[PDB]
Design a protein around this ligand. Structure first.
Ligand SMILES: N[C@@H](CCC(=O)N[C@@H](CS)C(=O)NCC(=O)O)C(=O)O
Ligand SMILES: N[C@@H](CCC(=O)N[C@@H](CS)C(=O)NCC(=O)O)C(=O)O
Lengths: 208, 208
C-alpha cells in the first residue's frame, strides 16, 4: 500500500495527504526526526537527498509532485483526456512556482521579505482565479468537471496563504468559493479537522 | 500543428525543441523581441506572464515542463507503464530542480556564486549517474528502454553544464557516455549542429 516518509510538518506532503484522505485511501506515516535526519544515513539514501520519500508497494518515489502525479495517474485524478491532463499539469506547475516563492520567504527571509511578498500576492493568485472563471464559471474544479491532483495542490497553496496573509482571497470570489467548496468535501473536511493534520505545523521553522 | 513562442534563446525551450526535432516533428518558431516583450501586451496575455507559450492546434499551453509532458504524453515518450511514467516524472523533477539553481546563478549572481556552484555540481549530478547505473548498466535511457521527455530535458541540462563547467562529466562514465550516445541520434545530431540551435545563445544575459 502507501507509505509517506517525512518530517513532522505539513509542508510538501499536505496536498498528497489531502488527496489520499479525500479519495478514501489508507496510508502509513513514517515520521523522521531531526536526530534521524541529522544522522545522515536516511538522507544519503534519498535520491536527491531529500524527503518526502513515498512507497507504493516496492515502488519508491521522491519529489512531492512526482507523488502527486503518480496518485493522480493511478487514482484517475489527471483529467478526462490528454488535453485536460495538459491543463492539469499547467495548473500544478503554476502552483509549484508560487510554492517555491512561499518556501523561499518562509525559510530564507520572512521578516524582511514578507511585505513585498504580500503586496505581490494578488498578482500571483490572479492566474488561478482566471482559470476558474474560464471553467464552468468556476463552479466545479480547476480543470474540467472532475477533481484532479492539481486541485489538492492548489487548495493547499491557497490554505497556507490565507494563514500567511489573512483575507488574501477576499479579492478573488471564485478562489474563495472554491476553497470553501473543496474544504467541505466530507472525507477532506474530516481530515482537515483531525489532529493528524491540525496538530502538525505548516512548516519546519515555526513560521507561517 | 506546433508553434513555440519564445525569446531568441535556447533556455527553457531547448529540451522540447530537441524532442520535436528528434521525433521528426515540425513546428513553427515565433520569436519575441525585447521591444515586443517590454511593450507589455503579450506578457499580460500570458497565463503566468511568462514564455514559452506553446500551441498545438487550438490548445494553448504555458510552462516548459507542461509542454514537455504534453509532447511526451501525446508522442509516447512517457514510459511503458504507470511505474515508468512515475520514474520519468521523478527524473524530470530532479532536472527542473537543478535547472532552477542554474538559472538563479546565471541571472542572479554568476560572478560571486560560480565557484560554490561548481564545487557543489558533482553532488547534484551524482543522482542521475546513479539512476543510469540502475537501468541496464546505463546503456539505454534514463528510464526504461525507450526514450522519454525526461531524457531530452536531462540531456539539455548536462549539455549546458559542460559549457558552464567543462569536464564536469569526466568523473561520471554513464552520464558522459549517455550524452555522447543521445547526441549521436541522427535527427538530434543534425538539429544540434544546425544554425537554428548553434546560433542561439544559451541564456538571455550572455552568460553561460
Ligand atoms: N523538489 C523536492 C523538494 C524536496 C525538499 O525540499 N525537501 C526538504 C524538506 S520539504 C528536505 O528534504 N530538506 C532536508 C535536506 O535538504 O537535507 C520535492 O518537491 O519533493
Ligand atoms: N516555470 C516557467 C518559467 C518561465 C520563465 O521563467 N519564463 C521567463 C523566461 S525563461 C520569462 O518569461 N521572463 C519574462 C518575464 O518574467 O516577464 C516555465 O517552466 O516555463
Amino acid at each position: 500500500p502507501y507509505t509517506v516518509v517525512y518530517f513532522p510538518v505539513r509542508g510538501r506532503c499536505a496536498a498528497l495527504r489531502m488527496l489520499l484522505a479525500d479519495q478514501g485511501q489508507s496510508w502509513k506515516e513514517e515520521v523522521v526526526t531531526v536526530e534521524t535526519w541529522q544522522e545522515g544515513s536516511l538522507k544519503a539514501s534519498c535520491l536527491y537527498g531529500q524527503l518526502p520519500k513515498f512507497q507504493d508497494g516496492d515502488l519508491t518515489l521522491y519529489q512531492s509532485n512526482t507523488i502527486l502525479r503518480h496518485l493522480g495517474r493511478t487514482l484517475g485524478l489527471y483529467g478526462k483526456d490528454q488535453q485536460e491532463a495538459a491543463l492539469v499539469d499547467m495548473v500544478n506547475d503554476g502552483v509549484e512556482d508560487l510554492r517555491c516563492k512561499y518556501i523561499s520567504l518562509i525559510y530564507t527571509n520572512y521578516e524582511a521579505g514578507k511585505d513585498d511578498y504580500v503586496k505581490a500576492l494578488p498578482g500571483q493568485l490572479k492566474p488561478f482565479e482566471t482559470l476558474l472563471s474560464q471553467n464552468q464559471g468556476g463552479k466545479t474544479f480547476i480543470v474540467g468537471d472532475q477533481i484532479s491532483f492539481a486541485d489538492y495542490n492548489l487548495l493547499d497553496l491557497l490554505l497556507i496563504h490565507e494563514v500567511l496573509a489573512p483575507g488574501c482571497l477576499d479579492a478573488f470570489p471564485l478562489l474563495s468559493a472554491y476553497v470553501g467548496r473543496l474544504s467541505a468535501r466530507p472525507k477532506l473536511k474530516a481530515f482537515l479537522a483531525s489532529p493528524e493534520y491540525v496538530n502538525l505545523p505548516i512548516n519546519g521553522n515555526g513560521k507561517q
